[PDB]
Design a protein around this ligand. Structure first.
Ligand SMILES: Nc1nc2c(ncn2[C@@H]2O[C@H](COP(=O)(O)OP(=O)(O)OP(=O)(O)O)[C@@H](O)[C@H]2O)c(=O)[nH]1
Ligand SMILES: [Mg+2]
Lengths: 1000, 326
DNA sequence: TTTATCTCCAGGCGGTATGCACTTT
DNA sequence: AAAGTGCATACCGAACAAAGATAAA
């Protein structure tokens, strides 16, 4: 069955008591709960086991005997854990051999195995050593055999990656070993501090008397708040302990896990980092709970002593990546980490959701109650009355209402006037300064000390992790190796581009290119009310945009002269995203413009041509002509490129007219240097070259269905010119609009030259995924409301027209595609009726489950400001959402296939010594190597679709969901619908190896 | 379903109630959803100047037959009173209409707020949309926009029993006292001009004219005494402190004060303003332990004006437009 | 007659008054 | 004999803001 909320909170209390090392409290609570008949039923075996282990670690035998008497009296039979704890304590106390003989003889009478004791998950290495010493008394020798390291994966797709009989050319960095070790020390200290301070990049404020007065007042308020928070924390601790001594549950051990100073510092950081509009109570609560769990994991590691083990293993591991050092046998970084001997990192038990929300709420209430401020800041001592800093206000949306903490209006003005020149970032949000830890298991990886989860999910979900941990160990090797390869790409920031961006941003901003503008340059009876409303709104959006830009630019300027790495993880489907949110290459055009590779490569014979093709692709003017025409066009506009590179702001300004600004500039800056060099074939390029794929989902449908016309339509066959379905759909829509406009309808006249590929691209893409007309209307409206050359008053009448015509253009565009989509949709629905969520396995081997469940019926926490309502993700007892599982089956499957293709390509590029990074379907590299990647890509695609993916999926679905005969009629229906798979066509995938524009 | 007058006795009783005043009977009565035209024909027999606002086109020619011979007394305009001045923007479709266009086609000029009532709208509230219609009317009235832009136009509408009871709740606390009652009794003078059993009104569904014993069965299910309620906007609604710019803060204050019904005024005031709550409650005259439910609408308006009249503190409210749309 | 509307990059209403069970004064 | 403690459901606000197209519900 499943545990109740109190049965979770009590277990969490007992487990936390072991870490906090207050066993008397746990013993008292257990005795009180066992004594009363009503609370006796709540206690389970694990609650006795936790206290028994805690007592055994100390070395008290009387208490362990008493708890064993309690558990034998209450009910149930002792399990292996109780006997393991008994042996551990008996060995601790140097018990006589006769007692050990008797205990183990009884244990054999029940009938178990001593090996399972040393394979117990809970027991650590020290506990295992102690119990081994204890058992060595009765048996003079006891041993557990070692084994060969985990076998390499044996599958059709991944065989070549893990085969030793071959030639390997694994790359290496460009840095000395000592520099790498120093960077490791810097990153370790940074993570231990848990904060970084960055010098603000905004325009400095000239000193004045008012600024100094504001700073002094701020300092005084900070000191007063610190003292008040310390006193409040002490009082709360005492009050919560008194409840424990009354035989009631509380959060005393949870609040005793960290020092008072650290909690106070975290609370002041949260107060200093509060937006002027405030935040909802539930959001502030999840944030405070999460920050406390991270600080406890880092501090536990520091106190125990794993920090030193990581330092030694890492410093020895850094020999593989450094250029100077050499490895006896080259291998994948995960393989070397395992072979070098792996320190054991024990997973941290996640707190239950109710406890997390309760702790967050308690901390937020303490923060709001403890801080107070004088009412009159400008006028000192006018009134001795003290006003709260934060206020609890309701905000009403439709019937519903929300609670919000809002700062006092004078505090915001004081902060604005003070203009502190230092921003504070959390260590998790900043890019690392040392190479990432190799992903060796789902539990450990990415950051040095902070906890990072493999599959990013909601704060309480656990089904994905248990599915990951229940699979064979060798299945996830490919995914882990791909993640490690992606995270091991050194980065750097461009200098002159950053200087130009700073010049534009600091002075006035250039909203045309993308740089926001300062609030100073802002626009300025019913009519007056409307004008003020518009002004306030516009000021709000511009302020938010400038705040985000300020954060990103400050972070970028901090790393001006450093090398940094970006770790990656994945979602539940399988697509990979970088971990640092603020600054990465997945962001806007400026983000893609500032970043560049750190390890350059010579251009070679075929580097300049690919650079020119990349420049033309970024420009966007020529996207239908072949490669020769793009190269010729790049040749034609050489003067404009050189002028833009030499004079970016004072000149002909050709680059600003590109579709992708700030990247055309960088590419021109590189191309001019390459051209002006004495030998352009011996020039080092640090600039990645993008490589995109057209109609990727349509490509995967074409591959699975093997439909000849569909394959030919999406560049999946050899051709001389690119093929685009979107352009054909746009042409058909334009023909229909021309006929309608000649007939006389006004909206046809309104939108005449605004039917481009952009407006219909997303809709045509998402039709095959089963999008409805409402979503298509919203997409077309969103596209239309940004042209700025279209009369907006027709938008509702425009999109509502276009969608229909667009859907018209699709009676019979796809047949096998829609057959496959309908089959998947019907299978998902029929599975969803029986109450079982749909699951599948990707060709790489990772398992995917789609967690859509009906809402929990009530979930509130009682309290002294408001009753927080929170969803209970983490209840497997709820019923599945048939509507959201039906709609999401195709897109998740195709995204998983895309991720598999990307991972295979990345691994086979790493084997040849390539710097491969990717964004979903865009494959970056150095300029010289692009052609090589192209080849392997096609190969992988063919292999990825050489296996019968659809047949394997059908058989797996039949095995998993039709084995149970519980509903015989519906089981027969599901068997019938799953045993009918659409037949393939007549298409030989070898032609993919020769097609030029499959990726272009 | 839509309710249309069915009998001539009703057609004359309602007409007499509408045009009861014998001194200056001339008003350009605006009648909405005429339906068959029985009420309009009765009003013409009594003598008036009707600007009919039918929603459906099918009835439009039919009314044209009744008033074809009459020259200027009756004007049929295809419009809906409850869709005037859409806030979405764009082109105004024929089913909707803009207030300026209507008051230009009718020739009505602009009348100051303190002056006499220019017009008189009559009709029935939506069958299932009383709350939304009342809230839209409240926003239009408190902001001097749309109809109430031109003046303090009287509105006389048929409403149900439950919404009327919720609209006429007092500090006597029948546990129906809420913000809608406060604003509507602060901005109007609600009176029960007449009462009618609901079965006395013909019911036409969107599908067609309702018939069959189901109509008789429906009669027992929804039997409630419909009230014809008269609303005139109050002359002294707007003051120095209460202006069309500051109505949002008053609305937020009233909504917040009813978030916790069983709470005192001082707690909400602490949650809403940085001012000394005890001093304010001393100025307004009420006691410290004053419940929100035991406050009159005039007390709420006086409290809001007293807070807004505080010169000493530069910052008065924590209300901000960022608190909306979230 | 009533409601949600392709997927992902991690989201949720807060108050009042009612019974029902059992433990505690 | 009364009274406290804690958990389950149910009905309140239906804050306005035009409109149309499809099927699970
Ligand atoms: N379901 C869904 N998938 C999307 C959406 N946007 C992008 N994708 C997926 O992302 C893939 C590639 O994204 P894009 O590069 O933007 O699309 P594309 O078809 O490659 O575009 P072109 O390069 O112009 O051909 C698509 O094939 C889809 O699988 C979306 O809104 N919904
Ligand atoms: Mg693409």
């Amino acid at each position: 069955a499943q545990l109740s909320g109190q049965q979770q909170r009590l277990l969490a209390f007992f487990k936390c008591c072991l870490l906090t090392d207050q066993l008397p409290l746990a013993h008292h609570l257990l005795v009180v709960h066992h004594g009363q008949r009503q609370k006796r039923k709540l206690l389970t075996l694990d609650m006795y086991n936790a206290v028994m282990l805690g007592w055994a670690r100390q070395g008290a035998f009387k208490e362990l005997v008493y708890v064993l008497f309690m558990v034998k009296d209450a009910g149930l039979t002792p399990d292996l854990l109780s006997y393991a704890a008994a042996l551990q304590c008996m060995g601790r106390q140097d018990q006589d051999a006769g007692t050990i003989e008797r205990c183990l003889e009884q244990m054999s009478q029940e009938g178990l195995k001593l090996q399972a004791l040393f394979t117990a998950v809970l027991l650590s290495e020290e506990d295992r050593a102690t119990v081994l010493k204890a058992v060595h008394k009765v048996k003079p020798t006891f041993s557990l055999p070692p084994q060969l390291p985990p076998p390499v994966n044996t599958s059709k797709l991944l065989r070549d990656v893990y085969a030793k009989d071959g030639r390997v050319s694994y790359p290496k960095l460009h840095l000395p070993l000592k520099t790498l070790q120093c960077l490791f020390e810097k990153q370790l200290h940074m993570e231990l501090a848990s904060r970084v301070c960055v010098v603000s990049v905004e325009k400095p404020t000239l000193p004045s008397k008012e600024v100094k007065h504001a700073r002094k007042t701020l300092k005084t308020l900070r000191d007063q708040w610190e003292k008040a928070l310390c006193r409040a924390l002490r009082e709360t601790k005492n009050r919560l302990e008194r409840e424990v001594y009354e035989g009631r549950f509380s959060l005393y051990p949870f609040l005793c896990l960290l020092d008072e100073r650290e909690v106070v510092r975290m609370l002041l950081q949260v107060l200093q980092a509060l937006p002027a509009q405030g935040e909802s109570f539930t959001t502030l609560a999840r944030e405070l709970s999460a920050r406390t769990f991270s600080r406890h994991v880092v501090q536990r590691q520091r106190v125990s002593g794993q920090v030193q083990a990581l330092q030694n293993h890492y410093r020895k591991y850094l020999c593989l990546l450094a250029s100077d050092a050499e490895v006896p046998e080259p291998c994948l970084p995960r393989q070397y980490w395992e072979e070098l001997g792996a320190p054991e990192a024990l997973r941290e038990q996640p707190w239950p959701l109710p406890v997390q929300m309760e702790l967050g709420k308690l901390l937020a209430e303490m923060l709001v109650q403890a801080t107070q401020m004088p009412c009159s800041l400008d006028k000192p001592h006018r009134s001795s009355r003290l006003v709260p800093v934060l206020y609890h206000v309701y905000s009403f949306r439709n019937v519903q209402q929300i609670g919000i903490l809002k700062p006092h209006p004078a505090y915001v003005q004081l902060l604005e006037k003070a203009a502190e020149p230092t921003l504070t970032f959390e260590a998790v949000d900043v890019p690392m300064l040392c190479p990432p830890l190799p992903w060796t298991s789902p539990h450990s990886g990415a950051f040095l000390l902070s906890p990072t989860k493999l599959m990013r999910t909601v704060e309480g979900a656990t089904q994905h992790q248990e599915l990951l941990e229940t699979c064979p160990p060798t299945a996830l090797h490919g995914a882990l190796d791909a993640l490690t390869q992606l995270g091991n790409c050194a980065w750097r920031v461009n200098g002159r581009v950053l200087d130009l961006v700073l010049q534009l941003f600091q002075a006035k901003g250039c909203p045309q290119l993308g740089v926001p503008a300062p609030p100073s340059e802002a626009p300025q009876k019913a009519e007056l009310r409307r004008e003020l409303a518009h002004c306030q709104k516009v000021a709000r959006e511009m302020h938010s945009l400038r705040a985000e830009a300020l954060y990103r630019l400050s972070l970028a300027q901090h790393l001006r002269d450093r090398v940094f790495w970006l770790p990656h993880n994945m979602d539940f489907r399988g697509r990979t995203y970088p971990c640092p949110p603020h600054f990465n290459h997945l962001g806007s055009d400026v983000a893609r413009a500032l970043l560049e590779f750190a390890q350059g490569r010579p251009l070679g014979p075929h580097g300049l041509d690919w650079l020119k093709i990349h420049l033309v692709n970024l420009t966007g003017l020529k996207k239908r002509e072949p490669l020769r025409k793009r190269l010729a066009f790049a040749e034609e506009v050489m003067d404009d490129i050189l002028d833009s590179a030499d004079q970016p702001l004072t000149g002909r300004k050709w680059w600003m007219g590109a579709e992708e600004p700030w990247q055309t500039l960088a590419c021109c800056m590189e191309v001019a240097n390459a051209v002006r060099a004495s030998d352009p074939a011996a020039y080092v390029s640090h600039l990645p070259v993008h490589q995109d794929g057209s109609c990727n989902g349509l490509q995967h449908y074409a591959a699975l269905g093997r439909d000849s016309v569909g394959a030919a339509s999406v560049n999946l066959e050899p051709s001389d010119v690119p093929q685009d379905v979107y352009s054909g759909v746009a042409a058909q829509v334009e023909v229909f609009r021309r006929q309608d406009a000649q007939r006389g309808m006004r909206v046809a006249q309104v939108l005449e030259g605004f039917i481009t590929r952009k407006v219909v691209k997303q809709t045509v893409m998402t039709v095959v995924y089963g999008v409805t007309r409402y979503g298509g209307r919203l997409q077309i409206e969103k596209r239309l409301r940004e042209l700025s050359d279209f009369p907006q008053e027709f938008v509702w009448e425009a999109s509502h027209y276009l969608v229909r015509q667009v859907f018209k253009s699709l009676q019979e565009m796809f047949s096998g595609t829609r057959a496959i989509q309908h089959w998947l949709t019907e299978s998902a629905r029929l599975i969803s009726h029986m109450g079982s969520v749909v699951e599948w396995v990707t060709p790489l081997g990772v398992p995917v489950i789609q967690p859509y469940r009906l809402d929990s019926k009530v979930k509130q926490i009682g309290g002294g400001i408001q009753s927080i309502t929170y969803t209970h993700n983490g209840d497997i007892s709820r019923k599945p959402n048939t509507r959201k599982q039906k709609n999401g089956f195709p897109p998740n499957f195709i995204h998983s296939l895309d991720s598999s293709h990307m991972m295979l390509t990345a691994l086979h590029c790493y084997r040849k010594g390539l710097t491969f990074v990717s964004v979903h379907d865009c494959y970056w590299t150095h300029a010289a190597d692009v052609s090589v990647m192209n080849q392997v890509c096609r190969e992988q695609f063919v292999r990825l679709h050489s296996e019968p993916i659809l047949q394997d999926l059908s058989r797996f679905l039949v095995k998993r969901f039709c084995s149970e005969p519980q509903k015989i009629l519906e089981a027969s229906q599901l068997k019938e619908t799953l045993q009918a798979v659409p037949k393939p066509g007549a298409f030989d995938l070898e032609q993919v190896k020769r097609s030029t524009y499959f990726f272009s | 379903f839509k309710r249309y007058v069915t009998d001539r006795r009703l057609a004359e009783t309602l007409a007499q109630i509408y045009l009861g005043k014998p001194s200056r009977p001339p008003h350009l009565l605006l009648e909405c959803n005429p339906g068959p035209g029985i009420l309009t024909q009765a009003l013409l027999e009594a003598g008036a100047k009707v600007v009919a606002l039918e929603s459906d086109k099918t009835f439009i020619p039919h009314l044209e037959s009744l008033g074809k011979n009459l020259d200027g007394k009756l004007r049929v305009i295809h419009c809906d009173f409850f869709k005037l001045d859409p806030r979405s923007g764009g082109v105004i479709k024929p089913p909707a209409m803009s207030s300026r266009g209507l008051f230009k086609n009718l020739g009505i000029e602009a009348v100051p707020w303190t002056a006499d009532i220019p017009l008189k709208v009559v009709g029935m509230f939506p069958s299932r949309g009383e709350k939304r219609a009342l809230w839209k009317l409240a926003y239009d009235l408190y902001s001097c926009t749309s109809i109430y832009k031109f003046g303090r136009i009287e509105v006389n509408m048929f409403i149900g029993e439950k919404e009327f009871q919720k609209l006429m709740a007092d500090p006597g606390n029948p546990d129906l006292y809420h913000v809608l009652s406060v604003i509507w009794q602060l901005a109007c003078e609600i009176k029960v001009l007449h009462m009618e059993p609901w079965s006395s009104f013909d019911i036409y569904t969107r599908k067609g004219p309702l018939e069959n014993p189901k109509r008789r069965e429906l009669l027992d299910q929804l039997q409630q005494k419909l009230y014809l309620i008269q609303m005139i906007p109050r002359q002294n609604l707007f003051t120095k402190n209460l202006t069309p710019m500051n109505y949002n803060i008053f609305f937020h204050l009233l909504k917040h004060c009813f978030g916790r019904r069983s709470a005192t005024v001082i707690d909400h005031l602490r949650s809403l303003t940085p001012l000394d709550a005890r001093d304010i409650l001393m100025q307004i005259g009420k006691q410290e332990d004053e419940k929100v439910v035991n406050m009159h609408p005039q007390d709420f308006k006086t409290l809001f004006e007293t807070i807004e009249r505080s010169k000493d503190c530069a910052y008065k409210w924590l209300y901000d437009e960022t608190l909306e749309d979230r």
